[PDB]
Amino acid sequence: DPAPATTFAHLDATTVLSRAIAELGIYPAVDPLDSTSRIMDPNIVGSEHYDVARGVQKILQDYKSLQDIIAILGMDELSEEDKLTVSRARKIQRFLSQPFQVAEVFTGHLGKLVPLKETIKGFQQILAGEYDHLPEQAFYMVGPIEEAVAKADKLA
Amino acid sequence: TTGRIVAVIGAVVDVQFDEGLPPILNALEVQGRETRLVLEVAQHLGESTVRTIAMDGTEGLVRGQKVLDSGAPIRIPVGPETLGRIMNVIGEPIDERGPIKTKQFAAIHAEAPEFVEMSVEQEILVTGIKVVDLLAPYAKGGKIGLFGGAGVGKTVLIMELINNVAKAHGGYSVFAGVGERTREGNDLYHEMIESGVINLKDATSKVALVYGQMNEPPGARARVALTGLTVAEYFRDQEGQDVLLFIDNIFRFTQAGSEVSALLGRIPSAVGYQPTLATDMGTMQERITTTKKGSITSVQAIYVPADDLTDPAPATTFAHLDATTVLSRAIAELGIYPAVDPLDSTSRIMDPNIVGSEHYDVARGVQKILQDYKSLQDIIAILGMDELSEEDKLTVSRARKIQRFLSQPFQVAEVFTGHLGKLVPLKETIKGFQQILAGEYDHLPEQAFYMVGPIEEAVAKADKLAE
Amino acid sequence: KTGTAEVSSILEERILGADTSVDLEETGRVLSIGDGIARVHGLRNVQAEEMVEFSSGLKGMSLNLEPDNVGVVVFGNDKLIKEGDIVKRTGAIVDVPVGEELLGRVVDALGNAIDGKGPIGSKARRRVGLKAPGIIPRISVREPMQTGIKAVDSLVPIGRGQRELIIGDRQTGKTSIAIDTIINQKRFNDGTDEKKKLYCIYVAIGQKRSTVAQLVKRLTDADAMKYTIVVSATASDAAPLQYLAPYSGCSMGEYFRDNGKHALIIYDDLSKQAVAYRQMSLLLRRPPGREAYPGDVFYLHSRLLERAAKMNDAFGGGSLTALPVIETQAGDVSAYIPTNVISITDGQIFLETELFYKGIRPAINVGLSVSRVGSAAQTRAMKQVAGTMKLELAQYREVAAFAQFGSDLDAATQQLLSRGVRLTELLKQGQYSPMAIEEQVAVIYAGVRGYLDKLEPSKITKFENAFLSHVISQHQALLGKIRTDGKISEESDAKLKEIVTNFLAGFEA
Amino acid sequence: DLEETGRVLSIGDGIARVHGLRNVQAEEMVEFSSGLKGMSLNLEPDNVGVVVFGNDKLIKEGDIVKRTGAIVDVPVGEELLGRVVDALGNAIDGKGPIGSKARRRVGLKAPGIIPRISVREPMQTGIKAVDSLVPIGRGQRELIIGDRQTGKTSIAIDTIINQKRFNDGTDEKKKLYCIYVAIGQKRSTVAQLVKRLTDADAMKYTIVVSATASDAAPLQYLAPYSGCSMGEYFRDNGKHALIIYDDLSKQAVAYRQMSLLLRRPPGREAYPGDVFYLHSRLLERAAKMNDAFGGGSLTALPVIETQAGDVSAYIPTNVISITDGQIFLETELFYKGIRPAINVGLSVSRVGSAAQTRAMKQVAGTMKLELAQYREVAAFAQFGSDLDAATQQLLSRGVRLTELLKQGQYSPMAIEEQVAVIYAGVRGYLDKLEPSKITKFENAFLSHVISQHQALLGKIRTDGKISEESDAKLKEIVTNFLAGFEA
Amino acid sequence: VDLEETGRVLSIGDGIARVHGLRNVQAEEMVEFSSGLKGMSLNLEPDNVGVVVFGNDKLIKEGDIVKRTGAIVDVPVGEELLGRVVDALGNAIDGKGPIGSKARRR
Amino acid sequence: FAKLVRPPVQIYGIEGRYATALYSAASKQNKLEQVEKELLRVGQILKEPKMAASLLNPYVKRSVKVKSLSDMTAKEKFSPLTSNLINLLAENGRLTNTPAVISAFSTMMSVHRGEVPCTVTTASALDETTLTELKTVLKSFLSKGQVLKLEVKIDPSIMGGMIVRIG
């Protein structure tokens, strides 16, 4: 569509959402499809930062391939190595979710903050997924992954 | 006054009337036009030049040519001498039996009657065709549109209705043949005499034929519809009659409107449309009603253009309907006759409230059953079964039985079918499905339901199909 | 001249001395008429967008002040018209009669309460051109709003001052959706607050007299009409009339709003308007555009619809709730105006036919149905049961992911489907429906606390009837209390529950 | 000579804005200095928008357009039989002239219902497939729909070829004036085609109206109308004329293009919708007339070409709604082999039985059905998934019967042969044979009965309606012969 | 007026100056507006010159005298653009002031 | 709107539409003749700077253009009241366009009882009678001249092609 098509030409950072993600309830509802700032790159950002992101983007894509079968099919048709990716991806999804205090009326969940080092770190662990002593969707809408870890336990 | 042909730009004859400017619609007579040439004023283009539409044979014409304004619209015979008669637009025996003398003449334009005179309420009227009533329960004096494509036994079906109904039906019926095939009228005609519903021992047959075949000037085809309406208005209001208004095919009326639109200097709207479609419709359909004099129960063949309904015309139409019969090319294609798109052969007047819930519910169960079934189809289509449960299979099968059961042979078109067709009095229908639903049929061969009306017969048919 | 009028009636005098001039400022002679598009020669000076009156006894609107003529939309017939006709200014733009004696009435949009009973004159008049409110004029909708349709009130729990799109294809009781709401408003109209007394405005745009006749009939049967304006520009009703009908309606609902009263306008439907208008444009050779529509139909609507708002106290606190309607064609919302509308309304209401055929009346895609708003117009009652429920339905659907072949990822979840289905039974609302909150939540409560899953889905409906009427009968004490609180009171939850369980026991067994 | 000359007011694009000619007849074909014709279609007050008939660059402004003062007629007559004409009814054959110095208006109309009498007619094409499943009457509009040598044409030739025999008969009623209107049909194609006819010399009762590929759009446009007049002549002379419009697809294209060029706009498929009016008007004149016209006919076998097999296509949908059935030819079968290649399923003549011949009817009643059953098992069966012995026969049988509706190019049958070869199968006598041996059988069987049982065959034709005697005779003849064919 | 090598801005607020005159304009000619600006008399209509405003405007107004530059546009070309950022006219934008492009070439 | 008479010429070349103004206006009151002749004056009175780019020139500014007719035609009594259309057409830019009107008009009371050859032989004799092509053939048959090439000379032309046209 010409209007956004063009718009893109002037951008410098973009938040590309995914209403599907939104629809998945997730707030934030984003979607890096070009949720970028061209100033993203391992030098510019931490290389770790960069690296963590690429690993993440990757997993999600693959996970994404399988994902409609699941959309029309539960927690089931898998080989587990691949389940690992599922879960992690699902976690990744979940950790990206951030509650919303500014929308507390709507959410019933209060917004949070994770400055960058924790964030990357957060994911580095998730990538390391230790949270296997832990379940996954008890990893929604936190700030610290920590609170998510906490939050799971009390449920149990 | 008098006009001069200033332009014949198509059959739009722009006539310049110099010192005359009779109101829009006024029928103008071309002087020298032996072809009884009504020009209908459409616009005062200015210059007392009018846009008119020529509605008769035109050629020979020279620019300047003299037109004598009849100063009013067409008068056409309205009232009873038309029954039997096949009239043209201008109200003229194309039954060709000497003139037509119904002494009440008409301008073929009329209004939407009052809301209070409108149907504020109507009733399910049985047809005795299972599918038909069931999904589309019909209201007396309303407008029912039959969407359906090309020659799909469309005609067959209507005929069959006509047969069942117009015959049954004591009242008058009006047939307004819009763009109707000369041939199709021929057959019908010959039949009509034959059927002796038209017998000319009664020019107060139960049927007036108005035919406005597709060979006609579009404008002419466009207006023949009104003609039929005007007469029928005669019959409703004047003759108090339960009119059946057989319209074949309202699409062509519209088609003519849209077709002309460009030329009118109007824009040919979306898909080329008439932008005046709506108003055309509004005026037309709203002219139809159940007054409390008579009822014009309106059977409207609606061609589904190019099979697009999304198509603005059909798109519009729905508003003006009360019952839609959408015939399914797929169902038809399954040879099933009834060839329906039952999932849009409907009546708003489906409701337990109205039609009793049994009907309704059963139907809803069915509507559902098909629906669910519908859902599966996309998977199964490449992917067969067993990735489905067998109750799903049951419904599928049932839906299928039902499918076949809607197939209900055609008594009329033994020429097409060889079958003799059935009328299903309602209970065999309600019951019928209740039973299949009840699984009472769910071990029979499905062809049992195929081309049957009453469900018993399906059983009978089952037995023999079970060898 | 040039293009326009080298008419040698025109030219013919210009010769002489440019003599021969009616007024041309406030009168004109119809330069040409055809197509209900009256280029009216003269009038020239004229205001912009003055409604004029034709020597056809019609009104028109001098919409287009063209430098030579005035493109005048004809509010009526035109065989009636001929050229040279005097079209006289009225000096005046549209106002429409406004008033309250339209409640109880079916009108033509001119404010002649025709119905074939003809009119009853709403003595006041009001410019239809009146604009949408400001921020200070506005205020928040915290206030809920009802339909007495469980689903609606629950899951897309409303408020008053709105702009919510009602969307779906015809007579699913498409209209029924509106009706049941209307019926429901009766109690509210008997309801003491005058925002409970909610003046219903059904703008019927292009809706045939017969359909309407039935509809009104339906209303008649409901005699909800008493608090209802039906602004009616039927299918026959001339395009500007139909076009006008919302704007007129629009001024009128704001009137109540600004007279503190809360009016609800149902625009059913702009779909027909656009067509008309566009057409209108087009006949004026003014554009089509996207989807053949010229684009300031958005401006039209954007301006039109903001006029439904929730006002502060300065406006008597009132509201004009707009529940605009578009009846789709195959859910074609890709459809320009729908696209627009998507950007306009603070949520939109989806119907699924699928469900409908399945029998699901209502058939709604709640999942899609949204009030972007949502919580701000809510009640705690509803909030207490509905949140989770939404969630549970989320799960039903989610588990509809595999509710396919298989439906047990475990019993619990199978159960969740059972529940979902149980709750579903509640979401169908037969024709004619007009609940109160307490009833709804009550019924919800049972299920959302899972008492129905033992019970089988068909009997939920049966139950639902029985239960509701049962509790209604006895525990008006309690219900009274819940109703009162506008919210579910815990004590009542238990007492209710106990009733419920037992009652349930009586229904089931 | 004042306004019997006019000056081309301006010209470009075959739209001759024409100065003068106002005294003009409406719908006058006019005459150019280039000798070219035009029609003053649109008489605007200013000029005459003249659809210029032909293709040009051969004109310039101020060129004299002289009235011809005539509304189009097209040369008409039986003297176009034995003629291939261009659309104007002029040679291209260059065999000197026609004899059709009578002319008859393209502007002539469809019968009144009273002037028309419904079809009950026979008329067979000699094509088993056709005559069986769409047995033909006369007057009828029937869509032939089929494509770019699917032998799309081949079939038509065979039909015509079949009519030869009637035209070699004295039965006018079974004679047919064949009119082959060629739209867009390239010259080579035509060259062959014509040539074929010559060879078949069925040409003698045959017009070929030929507007090949290059031809100007109006010409091609007109051509059907030309055709439209011409058969009606025969028809009023009680004769049964056949017009083949192959094809209006091209016409529409041309027309639209023409319209567009007229700036006159369109809608669907970029076509203006009175392309329907065009066809409707074109097609209504196809009729089986009442008795008043010698009961003539102009039987129309319109032809439509499916782009990508599509029919939902507005123009196809249209044509279908006009036609009294459609004959789907389905090419895949052709790749698959099958001559002819047909979607039989779609092939319907709603008219069908009204158009019949009792001889055939005796086997055909059963056959339509057995094939129906076969088809029913095309549908029920004939996947990679369906059988029982019952059906296995129908299939076997079916497959066999398929071969019988299979049918080589440049070759139709006499009806009695059709009934014959069919007969064997109807009573199930060659299911014994594989599908493969049927044709062989058929060939052999046919030359055998021709040789001996012309007695019978002649006879079966004679009673025009089989009888047990014939049956019985056939039965031995065939069975035994069959036994002879095989062993 | 001189509608030969000059034209008057026929209409403007199009950013395309429909300009009457400049008639002895070449095709594809660089012209110059009275508003400083260049335009190109891109379009030779009998009657006016569709002149693309070679830049942007809001300065321009009717009748403004549009003078032919009488030259078909060229841009500096050279060999000294190495290390150089230019505007599309082939003159800098680098802010390093000018390029070394001696030559201009169409 | 005004019931009027638009007699021969007619034809509405726009300037026929214009002509028709005076084809009812001059025509009525029959200041036809006054004007008919007026025009004759005007045309060539005009077409120099009092027409050309010292006028027609849009760069004159329209009001000023009036005020150089109304200084050009209320510059001339050759439009003592038919000036006004001038001063209108002026505004309406139809100034170069006047010949066609003038013609049409002038013709519209001359071609408002004339005739002209249009014939498949030579002339441009023209005529001012309605009945004709009888009279003229006695002026044809009388005088010998014209471009000869002027009208049909049915020789190079027809005839000239003809053997070729057979082959």
mmCIF file with all atom_site columns, N, CA and C in Angstrom, chain B residues 158-172:
data_model
loop_
_atom_site.group_PDB
_atom_site.id
_atom_site.type_symbol
_atom_site.label_atom_id
_atom_site.label_alt_id
_atom_site.label_comp_id
_atom_site.label_asym_id
_atom_site.label_entity_id
_atom_site.label_seq_id
_atom_site.pdbx_PDB_ins_code
_atom_site.Cartn_x
_atom_site.Cartn_y
_atom_site.Cartn_z
_atom_site.occupancy
_atom_site.B_iso_or_equiv
_atom_site.pdbx_formal_charge
_atom_site.auth_seq_id
_atom_site.auth_comp_id
_atom_site.auth_asym_id
_atom_site.auth_atom_id
_atom_site.pdbx_PDB_model_num
ATOM 1  N N  . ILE B 1 158 ? -38.967 -22.686 -12.013 1.00 0.00 ? 158 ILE B N  1
ATOM 2  C CA . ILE B 1 158 ? -40.031 -21.744 -11.905 1.00 0.00 ? 158 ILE B CA 1
ATOM 3  C C  . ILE B 1 158 ? -41.272 -22.264 -12.457 1.00 0.00 ? 158 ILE B C  1
ATOM 4  N N  . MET B 1 159 ? -41.136 -22.931 -13.585 1.00 0.00 ? 159 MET B N  1
ATOM 5  C CA . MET B 1 159 ? -42.200 -23.535 -14.267 1.00 0.00 ? 159 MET B CA 1
ATOM 6  C C  . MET B 1 159 ? -42.833 -24.506 -13.442 1.00 0.00 ? 159 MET B C  1
ATOM 7  N N  . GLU B 1 160 ? -42.036 -25.294 -12.761 1.00 0.00 ? 160 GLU B N  1
ATOM 8  C CA . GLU B 1 160 ? -42.542 -26.277 -11.910 1.00 0.00 ? 160 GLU B CA 1
ATOM 9  C C  . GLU B 1 160 ? -43.331 -25.629 -10.854 1.00 0.00 ? 160 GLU B C  1
ATOM 10 N N  . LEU B 1 161 ? -42.895 -24.474 -10.364 1.00 0.00 ? 161 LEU B N  1
ATOM 11 C CA . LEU B 1 161 ? -43.647 -23.796 -9.371  1.00 0.00 ? 161 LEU B CA 1
ATOM 12 C C  . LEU B 1 161 ? -44.901 -23.344 -9.850  1.00 0.00 ? 161 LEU B C  1
ATOM 13 N N  . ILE B 1 162 ? -44.865 -22.763 -11.007 1.00 0.00 ? 162 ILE B N  1
ATOM 14 C CA . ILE B 1 162 ? -45.942 -22.189 -11.680 1.00 0.00 ? 162 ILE B CA 1
ATOM 15 C C  . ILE B 1 162 ? -46.953 -23.205 -11.836 1.00 0.00 ? 162 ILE B C  1
ATOM 16 N N  . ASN B 1 163 ? -46.473 -24.353 -12.239 1.00 0.00 ? 163 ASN B N  1
ATOM 17 C CA . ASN B 1 163 ? -47.244 -25.490 -12.444 1.00 0.00 ? 163 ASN B CA 1
ATOM 18 C C  . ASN B 1 163 ? -47.907 -25.788 -11.178 1.00 0.00 ? 163 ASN B C  1
ATOM 19 N N  . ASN B 1 164 ? -47.159 -25.853 -10.114 1.00 0.00 ? 164 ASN B N  1
ATOM 20 C CA . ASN B 1 164 ? -47.804 -26.310 -8.946  1.00 0.00 ? 164 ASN B CA 1
ATOM 21 C C  . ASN B 1 164 ? -48.744 -25.308 -8.415  1.00 0.00 ? 164 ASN B C  1
ATOM 22 N N  . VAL B 1 165 ? -48.333 -24.070 -8.576  1.00 0.00 ? 165 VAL B N  1
ATOM 23 C CA . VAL B 1 165 ? -48.899 -23.027 -7.836  1.00 0.00 ? 165 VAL B CA 1
ATOM 24 C C  . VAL B 1 165 ? -49.815 -22.273 -8.622  1.00 0.00 ? 165 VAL B C  1
ATOM 25 N N  . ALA B 1 166 ? -49.371 -21.606 -9.689  1.00 0.00 ? 166 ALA B N  1
ATOM 26 C CA . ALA B 1 166 ? -50.237 -20.768 -10.471 1.00 0.00 ? 166 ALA B CA 1
ATOM 27 C C  . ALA B 1 166 ? -51.463 -21.485 -10.907 1.00 0.00 ? 166 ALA B C  1
ATOM 28 N N  . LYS B 1 167 ? -51.286 -22.802 -11.135 1.00 0.00 ? 167 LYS B N  1
ATOM 29 C CA . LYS B 1 167 ? -52.354 -23.701 -11.365 1.00 0.00 ? 167 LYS B CA 1
ATOM 30 C C  . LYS B 1 167 ? -53.199 -23.750 -10.188 1.00 0.00 ? 167 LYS B C  1
ATOM 31 N N  . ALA B 1 168 ? -52.651 -24.204 -9.059  1.00 0.00 ? 168 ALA B N  1
ATOM 32 C CA . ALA B 1 168 ? -53.394 -24.293 -7.837  1.00 0.00 ? 168 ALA B CA 1
ATOM 33 C C  . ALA B 1 168 ? -54.146 -23.030 -7.503  1.00 0.00 ? 168 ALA B C  1
ATOM 34 N N  . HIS B 1 169 ? -53.392 -21.973 -7.177  1.00 0.00 ? 169 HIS B N  1
ATOM 35 C CA . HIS B 1 169 ? -53.734 -20.592 -7.120  1.00 0.00 ? 169 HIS B CA 1
ATOM 36 C C  . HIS B 1 169 ? -54.819 -20.213 -8.017  1.00 0.00 ? 169 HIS B C  1
ATOM 37 N N  . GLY B 1 170 ? -55.905 -19.706 -7.435  1.00 0.00 ? 170 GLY B N  1
ATOM 38 C CA . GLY B 1 170 ? -57.056 -19.328 -8.170  1.00 0.00 ? 170 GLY B CA 1
ATOM 39 C C  . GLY B 1 170 ? -56.936 -17.961 -8.701  1.00 0.00 ? 170 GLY B C  1
ATOM 40 N N  . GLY B 1 171 ? -56.237 -17.066 -7.978  1.00 0.00 ? 171 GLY B N  1
ATOM 41 C CA . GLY B 1 171 ? -56.136 -15.691 -8.366  1.00 0.00 ? 171 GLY B CA 1
ATOM 42 C C  . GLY B 1 171 ? -55.548 -15.475 -9.706  1.00 0.00 ? 171 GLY B C  1
ATOM 43 N N  . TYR B 1 172 ? -55.376 -14.202 -10.051 1.00 0.00 ? 172 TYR B N  1
ATOM 44 C CA . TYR B 1 172 ? -54.587 -13.857 -11.179 1.00 0.00 ? 172 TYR B CA 1
ATOM 45 C C  . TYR B 1 172 ? -53.189 -13.941 -10.831 1.00 0.00 ? 172 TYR B C  1
#
